[PDB]
Amino acid sequence: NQIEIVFAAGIALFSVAAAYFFWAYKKDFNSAFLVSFITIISYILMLEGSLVSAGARGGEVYATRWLFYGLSCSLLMYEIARFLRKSQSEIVFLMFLTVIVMGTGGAAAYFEGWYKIGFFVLSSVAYVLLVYPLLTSVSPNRSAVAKYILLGWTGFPIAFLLAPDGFGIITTTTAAILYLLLDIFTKVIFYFDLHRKMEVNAQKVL
Amino acid sequence: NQIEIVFAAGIALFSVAAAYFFWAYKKDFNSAFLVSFITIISYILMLEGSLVSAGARGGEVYATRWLFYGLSCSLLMYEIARFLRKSQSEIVFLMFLTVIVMGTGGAAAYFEGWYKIGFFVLSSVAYVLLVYPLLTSVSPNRSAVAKYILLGWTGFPIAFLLAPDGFGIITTTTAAILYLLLDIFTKVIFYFDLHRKMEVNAQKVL
Amino acid sequence: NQIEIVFAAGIALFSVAAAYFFWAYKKDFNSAFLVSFITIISYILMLEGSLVSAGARGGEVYATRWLFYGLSCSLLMYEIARFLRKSQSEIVFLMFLTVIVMGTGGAAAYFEGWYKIGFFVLSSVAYVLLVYPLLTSVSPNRSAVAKYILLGWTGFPIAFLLAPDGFGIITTTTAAILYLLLDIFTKVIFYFDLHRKMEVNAQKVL
Ligand SMILES: *C/C=C(C)/C=C/C=C(C)/C=C/C1=C(C)CCCC1(C)C
Ligand SMILES: *C/C=C(C)/C=C/C=C(C)/C=C/C1=C(C)CCCC1(C)C
Ligand SMILES: *C/C=C(C)/C=C/C=C(C)/C=C/C1=C(C)CCCC1(C)C
Ligand SMILES: CCCCCCCCCCCC
Ligand SMILES: CCCCCCCCCCCC
Ligand SMILES: CCCCCCCCCCCC
Ligand SMILES: CCCCCCCCCCCC
Ligand SMILES: CCCCCCCCCCCC
Ligand SMILES: CCCCCCCCCCCC
Ligand SMILES: CCCCCCCCCCCC
Ligand SMILES: CCCCCCCCCCCC
Ligand SMILES: CCCCCCCCCCCC
Ligand SMILES: CCCCCCCCCCCC
Ligand SMILES: CCCCCCCCCCCC
Ligand SMILES: CCCCCCCCCCCC
Ligand SMILES: CCCCCC
Ligand SMILES: CCCCCC
Ligand SMILES: CCCCCC
């Protein structure tokens, strides 16, 4: 129905994003390229539709989006935590909480009843412990990254609760469109805005 | 039947353990918190029961316990190997053997016939090569960690063979109770006993 | 039929290879041992046959071979990239492209229609970006590794297209035999030829 158009739009946008990020940025470790490329793979699988599950109020759930975030958001968390000049051990810790948040989030979306509630509570506890050291960072770059944590990262659990993954108050297509806007904001706009600042900060403490 | 009570007990204990370890320990990389948190996730999945398989002598197998160990026991092996002051390259090697041991162990538990035997032999070869450099460590902390390798880590393959994962000589609930006691010993008591020693050793070679 | 003999041959050869590599090489991080050991696990699963899927022209596909390559070829890429003295950040980048190439390759093999084509194109783009920095390396070891990239690594996508994973022009058993020869060349002969050179190069920039 309309959902294939949402997924097809995500494949095209992140294919353009991955192509730009590779050519425009330095030919070395390119997190921006890897994040968009992983997202392309995730949208193709969601478009194939073999991994769709029943959601709330007659909606559907694509829990593999949450599993692919664990790989792509750990790369984002690496850039974010390094931008705030967290210690190496704190970076490793935050990247683990991110994998935990997405992993339990996919389980919360796929399962039902008290298991959806329990996995959501666990994922939100790990999320609270993930963003607390970032929102209270003494770094001067803290305000520059709070816009992406508060608007983008925290928009997903809210979308989750409204989507068929949670209470199913919005339909599956509306959730996919809102997920896509959140993806563009946290994966593409995030680099258009902060790449050079992150690049300069990284050539000074490495 | 009685097994849900065993899994519910594990969820409550490791939720208390994860809560204590986070608040009591330093607000940086907390392996003790991550190990217990991962174990909570594993026990909820086992309690949901969608990933249960037929075992030996009419028992059942929860092979995802073994897959989740590959993530949580690699964190334990990191602390153990660093405590014995293994080289960084030896630490990376041991963490790989741990993932191999748990991964092949989950396959041994899930499959039957000569494949259970073959996967068990492979997992035990990798296990022998994993613990040999630890039991013969020249570190003075070697005796302090041998109690957990011999009593706790080596108790799992013995429990495996008795459980429905192996010959099914004990029932599924008895195996779950014995697994839970082994979990508490190797994941919780391990830190009550060795945290400060490991913390002091780590602030001296890092 | 004949395919079990191909898989049984792979189990025996890599069991001999893993046994030799462990005993002959230094008792520290042994990539050669880990690569062969992982390959043993992969061939046993393929021999068990629960993860076989329908292929092209009545052939079959064992897509888990491609998923296990993502773990074992990242170890090979680590040795290759370190041998060419790539920077640490470039090594991490190449190991990610390898996981992407194998991951999308398993999806290309498992799915059909435009999804097989799309996943193949994505996997080949990531493959082109993976081998370009290696084939144009200014390292003097570049020619010593180009034989394995061109003959061995690039033989897999060609075999893929001929195998039931692609167009199904060759049968499943012929593909398995050709996969096995490629495995022996890139995983075993690769170390018989380059171990000491790689060992000496590694004791000079570490
Ligand atoms: C590119 C994708 C990004 C940055 C996604 C971030 C996603 C989250 C922070 C999701 C968080 C969730 C919770 C906070 C708990 C409930 C379930 C989740 C996974 C939606
Ligand atoms: C928190 C969990 C820990 C420390 C678990 C350790 C588990 C093992 C060492 C399991 C070992 C096994 C073998 C030695 C081979 C047979 C199968 C296994 C996986 C049970
Ligand atoms: C031990 C195994 C090795 C070194 C395997 C390497 C495999 C590849 C480079 C496979 C590449 C593929 C492509 C280039 C795209 C099409 C699908 C693949 C996965 C076969
Ligand atoms: C210098 C760049 C290092 C980047 C390391 C990122 C590691 C990502 C691991 C994600 C595991 C899910
Ligand atoms: C489509 C099925 C998704 C179920 C989620 C799997 C559970 C992953 C937990 C990861 C915890 C680190
Ligand atoms: C029908 C039984 C449902 C059990 C739900 C598990 C609750 C997990 C809570 C995790 C947070 C402590
Ligand atoms: C015809 C359906 C359109 C639904 C679009 C939902 C997009 C939500 C955007 C929320 C703005 C922050
Ligand atoms: C300083 C703390 C570093 C801890 C690194 C642990 C990495 C765990 C990887 C487990 C992979 C299964
Ligand atoms: C529930 C199915 C469990 C089967 C085990 C999967 C095989 C994992 C092998 C990992 C080797 C590193
Ligand atoms: C029916 C055929 C069963 C084949 C069992 C595989 C044996 C694997 C042995 C691994 C250790 C060398
Ligand atoms: C009523 C069933 C109780 C079974 C409890 C088994 C616990 C085994 C403990 C072994 C002590 C080391
Ligand atoms: C000194 C040896 C370090 C080897 C690091 C290899 C890491 C492999 C990760 C593969 C992830 C799929
Ligand atoms: C047997 C099913 C194989 C399907 C392939 C799974 C997709 C893995 C994508 C990994 C991308 C990093
Ligand atoms: C840009 C490369 C990825 C192209 C993915 C194509 C997806 C196929 C859609 C098939 C619709 C029936
Ligand atoms: C009886 C079937 C034998 C098929 C063997 C195929 C092996 C292909 C080798 C290609 C040489 C590079
Ligand atoms: C088929 C689901 C794959 C998810 C890998 C993160
Ligand atoms: C559904 C099984 C998940 C296991 C991840 C380690
Ligand atoms: C059952 C498939 C396991 C693949 C792990 C790489």
Q: Token digits for A117?
A: 């509630």
Main-chain phi, psi angles of C67, to 5 degrees: -75, -35
For C89, the closest of A28, A40, A48 (CB atoms) is A28
Q: Please, what is the angle between helix C88-110 and helix C114-135, to 10°?
A: 160
In angstroms, the first-to-last Cα distance of chain B is: 49
CB C98 within 8 A of CB C73: yes
CA–CA dist C1, B192 (Å, integer): 56
User: Which residue shows structure tokens 């890139």?
Assistant: C186
Half-sphere exposure of C165 (CA within 13 A, CB side): 27
Are the CB atoms for C144 and C191 separated by under 8 Å?
Answer: no
- The answer for residues whose C-beta is within 8 angstroms of residue A200's C-beta and 6 or more apart is none
Query: What is the distance between the alpha carbons of residues B31 and B74, in angstroms, rounded to a whole number?
Result: 10
**Do B133 and C27 make contact, defined as CB atoms within 8 angstroms?**
yes
- Per-residue DSSP letters for C161-178? HHSTTTT--S-HHHHHHH
Question: Residue written as tokens 């992969």?
Answer: C42
Q: Looking at residue C58, what DSSP letter applies?
A: G
Q: Name the experiment that determined this structure.
A: X-ray
| HSE, side-chain direction, 13 A CA sphere, residue A28 | 7
Question: Which parts of chain C are beta strand (E)?
Answer: 53-54, 60-61
Q: Minimal CA–CA distance to A60: which of A52, A68, A48?
A: A52
Distance between CA atoms of residues C82 and C80, nearest Å? 6
Token representation of residue A105: 């989030």
Q: Domain range spanning residue C17? A: 3-202
Count of domains observed in chain C:
1
Please count the residue pairs, one from chain A and one from chain C, whose beta carbons lie less than 8 angstroms apart: 33
Q: Which residues contact B88 (CB under 8 A, 6 or more apart)?
A: none
Buried b or exposed e, range B46-71, using 16+ CB within 10 angstroms: bbbeeeebebbeebbbbbbbbbbbbb
Cα distances (angstroms) measured from residue A93 to each of A107, B33, B152, B170: 21, 10, 26, 39
CB atoms closer than 10 angstroms to residue C49? 12
Please state, as a whole number, how many other Cβ atoms lie within 10 Å of the Cβ of residue C112. 15
Pull the structure tokens for residue B125: 């070869």
CATH number at residue A96: 1.20.1070.10
In whole angstroms, give the CA distance from residue B118 to residue B104. Answer: 9
C-beta separation of B9 from B180 below 8 A: yes
Contact criterion met (CB < 8 Å) for A107 and B41: yes
Other CB atoms closer than 10 Å to residue A16's CB: what's the count? 12
Distance CA B84, CA B76 (A): 12
Residue found by looking up tokens 């092979």 in the block: B63
Q: Which of B29, B34, B41 sits opposite A89 (nearest CB)?
A: B29
Asked if C29 reaches chain B (Cβ–Cβ under 8 Å), the answer is yes
Among A residues 30-69, those touching chain C with beta carbons less than 8 Å apart: 30, 34, 37-38, 40-41, 44-45, 48
The answer to whether the beta carbons of residues C10 and C21 sit under 8 Å apart is no
- Could you write out the DSSP letters of every residue in A146-196? HHIIIIIITHHHHHHHHSTTTT--S-HHHHHHHHHHHHIIIIIIHHHHHHH
Name the residue among B178, B150, B183 with its Cα closest to residue B69.
B183
List the resolution, Å: 2.6
Nearest to B163 by CA among B61, B28, B51: B61
Give the other-Cβ count within 10 Å of B27's Cβ: 12
CB atoms within 10 A of CB A27: 12
* Total residue length of chain B: 206
